[PDB]
Design a protein around this ligand. Structure first.
Ligand SMILES: [Cl-]
Lengths: 186, 188
């Protein structure tokens, strides 16, 4: 909904400019142009709001990658699909991406937010483990290969968001080829 | 013989900068965690900006030394990469605290002119090698800062993951991470 979305957008801008601990529900109500009582109809408190935001973002990233996932294709294509859908999600949901990326291990996260994230991670662990066994990927610990793919992307999104680097189809194409070469057997 | 309390002060400051943020941390807080008097910290450093600049400068110069020592100038970019990567991993492995801090605050507002000149002289050295590699058609035609990120960010996170005990260090782990990073930046 446009109400839910403006509450989350207004909450993200305040969490970034005034910190999560410093932000309150009335501040989000003022920036979203709604009543504090209407926010309390959707969310019991700020911790419920930030867990609805985190969870929805994770399931949107999970939907984006899992939608049209090329199950019958090779490792190369499954990687290409995952990488581009991951980059496209980050690119279009930078605040949510930068916010979700910055709070995966936060103290305010609830059991469902953690189960959503672990179920998402585990999906790629199993593909990576299958790739290692077939001799298709480097025999590195699966968590080391996720780090190799994810950390450069995560930082490049941050650097693009500051305007230090600029997005282009050519840049993602170069970054995707680089990440595939980093994890495959040569 | 008068022992240098700077190591204990830097360790105490980083634990507070990590748990309470650099802006939230003060000199009395560092004095309490270091188990020293506030006045003894002010003997070494005029303020928190001086302390943090000393910490930054010292770490960057110890990392610079670790890579520039026995640097294989007459070797190919493959060997120069291998040398750089291993010396970088060895420095990070043995100086876990300071390495993470320093390379995450290399564009911070609190860095003085000398800290910035130390860092710019260090990074520019690798920018030149990367630019030569791109021109020769050996490295990927990516912005040089994107190739530094590709090499550095996975390493930085693997050090953090090893530091939690989730992953364990081994000579074969670094050998494989080094081959992976070279394959990430070269034209195959
Ligand atoms: Cl900080």
């Amino acid at each position: 909904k446009n109400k839910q979305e403006d509450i989350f957008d207004a909450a993200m801008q305040l969490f970034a400019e005034r910190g999560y601990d410093g932000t309150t529900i009335p501040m989000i109500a003022e920036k979203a142009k709604v009543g504090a009582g209407t926010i309390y109809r959707y969310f019991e408190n700020k911790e419920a709001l930030v867990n609805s935001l985190f969870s929805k973002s994770m399931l949107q990233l999970s939907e984006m990658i899992k939608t049209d996932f090329p199950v019958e294709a090779n490792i190369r294509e499954q990687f290409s699909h995952t990488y581009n859908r991951l980059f496209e999600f980050a690119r279009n949901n930078v605040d949510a991406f930068l916010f979700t990326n910055s709070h995966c291990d936060s103290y305010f996260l609830d059991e469902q937010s953690k189960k959503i994230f672990d179920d998402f991670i585990g999906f790629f662990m199993n593909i990576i483990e299958d790739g290692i066994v077939k001799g298709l990927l480097r025999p590195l610990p699966p968590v080391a290969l996720i780090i190799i793919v994810y950390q450069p992307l995560e930082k490049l999104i941050k650097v693009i968001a500051t305007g230090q680097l600029e997005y282009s189809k050519e840049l993602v194409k170069e970054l995707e080829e680089s990440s595939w070469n980093a994890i495959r057997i040569i």
